[PDB]
A paper describes a structure:
AAA+ proteases are a family of proteases that proteolytically cleave substrates from which the substrates are unfolded and delivered to the cleavage sites driven by ATP hydrolysis. Among these AAA+ proteases, FtsH (Filamentation Temperature Sensitive Protein H) is the only known family anchored on membranes where it is able to hydrolyze both soluble and membrane protein substrates. The quality control and regulation of membrane proteins by FtsH play a critical role in cell viability and stress resistance in response to changing environments. FtsHs contain four domains: N-terminal periplasmic and transmembrane domains and C-terminal ATPase and protease domains.
We report here the cryo-EM structure for Thermotoga maritima FtsH (TmFtsH) in a fully ADP-bound symmetric state. We overexpressed the full-length, protease deficient TmFtsH H423Y mutant and purified it in detergents n-Dodecyl-B-D-Maltoside and N,N-Dimethyldodecylamine N-oxide (LDAO) and used negative staining to check particle quality. Therefore, we expressed a membrane scaffold protein MSP1D1 and reconstituted the purified TmFtsH into MSP1D1 nanodiscs in soybean polar lipids. Consequently, our final reconstruction at 3.15 Å resolution used 86,652 particles, consisting only the ATPase and protease domains. The reconstructed map used a six-fold symmetry and displays a higher resolution for the protease domains and lower resolution for the ATPase domains. ADP bound endogenously to TmFtsH and survived the co-purification and reconstitution processes. Our cryo-EM structure may thus represent a fully ADP-bound resting state structure in a six-fold symmetry under physiological conditions. As we used a zinc-binding-deficient mutant H423Y for cryo-EM analysis, we did not model zinc ions in the protease domains. Consequently, the bottom view indicated a shrink of the ATPase pore from the apo to ADP state by a movement of 4.5 Å as measured by the distance between the Cα atoms of residue V235 which is located on the tip of a pore loop. In addition, there are structural changes for the arginine finger in the next clockwise subunit where residue R318′ Cα atom (“R318′” denotes next clockwise subunit) moved 3.6 Å closer to the ADP phosphate groups in the ADP-state structure.
Residue numbers in the entry:
A (entry chain B), B (entry chain A): 158 to 266, 281 to 528, 541 to 603
The structure:
Amino acid sequence: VTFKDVGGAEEAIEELKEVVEFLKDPSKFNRIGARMPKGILLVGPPGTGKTLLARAVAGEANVPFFHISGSDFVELFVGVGAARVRDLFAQAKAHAPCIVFIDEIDAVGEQTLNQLLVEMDGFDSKEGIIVMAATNRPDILDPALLRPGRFDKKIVVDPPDMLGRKKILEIHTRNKPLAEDVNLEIIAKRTPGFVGADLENLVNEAALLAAREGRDKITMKDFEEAIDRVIAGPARKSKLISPKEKRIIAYYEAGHAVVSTVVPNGEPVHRISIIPRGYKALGYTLHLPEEDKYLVSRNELLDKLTALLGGRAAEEVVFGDVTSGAANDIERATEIARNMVCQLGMSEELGPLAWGKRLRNYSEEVASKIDEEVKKIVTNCYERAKEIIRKYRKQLDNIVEILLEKETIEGDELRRILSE
Amino acid sequence: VTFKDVGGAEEAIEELKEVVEFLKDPSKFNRIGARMPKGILLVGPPGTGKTLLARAVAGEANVPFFHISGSDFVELFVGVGAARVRDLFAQAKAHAPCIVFIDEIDAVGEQTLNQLLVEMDGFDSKEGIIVMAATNRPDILDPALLRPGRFDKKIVVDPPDMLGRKKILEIHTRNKPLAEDVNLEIIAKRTPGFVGADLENLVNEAALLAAREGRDKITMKDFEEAIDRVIAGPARKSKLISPKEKRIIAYYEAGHAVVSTVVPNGEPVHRISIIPRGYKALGYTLHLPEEDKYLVSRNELLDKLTALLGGRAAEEVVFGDVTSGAANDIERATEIARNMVCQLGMSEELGPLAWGKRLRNYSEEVASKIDEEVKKIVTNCYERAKEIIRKYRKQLDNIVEILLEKETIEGDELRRILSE
Ligand SMILES: Nc1ncnc2c1ncn2[C@@H]1O[C@H](COP(=O)(O)OP(=O)(O)O)[C@@H](O)[C@H]1O
Ligand SMILES: Nc1ncnc2c1ncn2[C@@H]1O[C@H](COP(=O)(O)OP(=O)(O)O)[C@@H](O)[C@H]1O
């Protein structure tokens, strides 16, 4: 369980390597005056992998490891926790420099608490005793533990970025017999926000779906379809859609994808489907990012707003009678335009100011000029999505009639059709 | 542990010297009628160093010292605290004039409380019994303890000013083997708001970082880099920034430093770096004050506001497309301009009045004249930062191309480049 078995956190490893060294040659840290801390506090979102790091460092240099959970101290009989703690340190002091882990310390931090503080102060840091604490919350902790001599050194763990998830997938798939067409980079970019714990569950679910039919390999189709069942839900083939009502959905989704391709700034589409899924959903479009970005320009916000108004601009041109389907793409397209004006200061009339944060302190004369700008930004974009559709209309029907039988179209075919 | 080992508080020492004298010649205070108090209450922010003063005064004249913590009285069995208190005074009365310290009295101030008040009133102040109490909160204390005869004399401790931190650093670094280029005045001015407890931790962390590589001296580079890891966090070299996206940050930070140098009133820069650090940060600039000030003029507030609008005025002139990076320098530059008008009364139209403190009691006709002034102060400054940049443009590119390879530039090189 060396450091080669943990991936996705290069700042909790490089920073936490001298502790291994300190357990090898403690003479280097006494010639100067170093006072290597007795306790280490790991903090981060739950499920990040805090517990695995302690096991990894314990196994890095052959050393006994004693794991104790603070949840076990909950609802224990009076005095049992104190006796367990005393026996733990009694065992620890008998052996060589050891590693002791205490988990879930937020809940504990009454009788066992005070006994812990006194007993911790008893032994010396030169014996070889290391205490590692892992909390899911840094605020509800007991303030007394933050005093010097107690837990004072903290390590922050963070969710992985794009390259971290690739490494985690590489780690967790070594044993299983993958097929020959499985690409782990594609599956790495379609899973943003996943903590390291969920990817193993994803692999297990893909294995289950591969095993249901019965076959010794896991193909790409199992991976891609297993991701959808986690985000939205299982497919619902029992639902019945009227033939004159599924023609509207075919035009509402084939218009959101034509507009999102013509405009310069955007991310490419992956597939379009109209199979119902989950509760209150009738069709979706998927994008895959090209890289990871941290700064957003202005022209990249006027083209994410035109795409959202693409579906509503396709019903109006074709049918002429607007439906109630596009009620969530209007709510999310009007708070994008209320940040370009109030907070980010990208309006040429109100200047570089931050009107807002209770949550409203300004006059009524000003409040009637923010609306004349919001209603002008949104209307100006909605007049351009309609203009885009009118050019690509003969090539918009072809995308529909293909989508009304196969019920799914791929991105490459779409981009081949648009560019005749 | 005499007074020579405590620095940074010259008002809790000069005021607390006759207590040492009173324990030497108590005859001077009885010829007139002095009734030197039995209890002394030390109040101040936590970690200021209240506990150290009691030990210092106890060691000033050779006298037994008995320390008891009020946190120990918490969750003790019924009657144990009273027995401990009785045994404490029983031991104290047997010896010469002694010193007894009670810590953390805010939590205690039920059964032990009443026993303390009665037993305190028992003995006489002429025996040589002194009681020192240290609380972190002056409001939650039991009001009964404020009656005469009980704790009535209080001493307030305060965080050190600029010269105090120098003395604390001098005290805590005597043993350790510093290098020859370490300047303690520079490190004293870059640590505002630090209480006396944090500087020793800073020294220990610098020692750790010096020891990691292995060398018998601590150079300046270890001190300066150890301060950053406390304020913001460790460097994150795993983060990847697109080549076309780190060119924007190089222009946003090289513009905030050119403007902050040309304007008359300001504090000099120290270094510019674009290495990511912490969470949601992509570049920072550091200043070092020349001295400590307590009054701020008006012209010193119109030049701290032009500097903040320097980054946004560098993207607009160069690229022409404003990004979302400068969203925190707009929020902090619009509450500076809402104090020059409402509270401080530095507006020539609304006169010397204080509109405001619920938090709003005035008409709507007035509320529409504060905005016409706020929008005029901010816009007038933003038209001048752009004017500054246009002059120093040939000398703004040189600062960038140097900053795109070394990833760090020093203040002296910047001020040499600007003044050709
Ligand atoms: N960086 C990582 N590399 C590989 N696997 C990880 C990583 N982080 C977390 N995991 C996986 O996530 C799972 C959950 O870990 P767990 O101990 O529950 O986290 P925590 O203790 O922080 O809740 C572990 O089985 C581990 O395999
Ligand atoms: N004025 C000072 N001079 C030198 N060291 C100080 C001073 N004030 C505080 N310290 C240091 O801060 C540390 C914390 O003191 P502590 O007793 O915890 O403060 P408090 O009791 O007020 O919380 C001590 O180890 C002491 O060395």
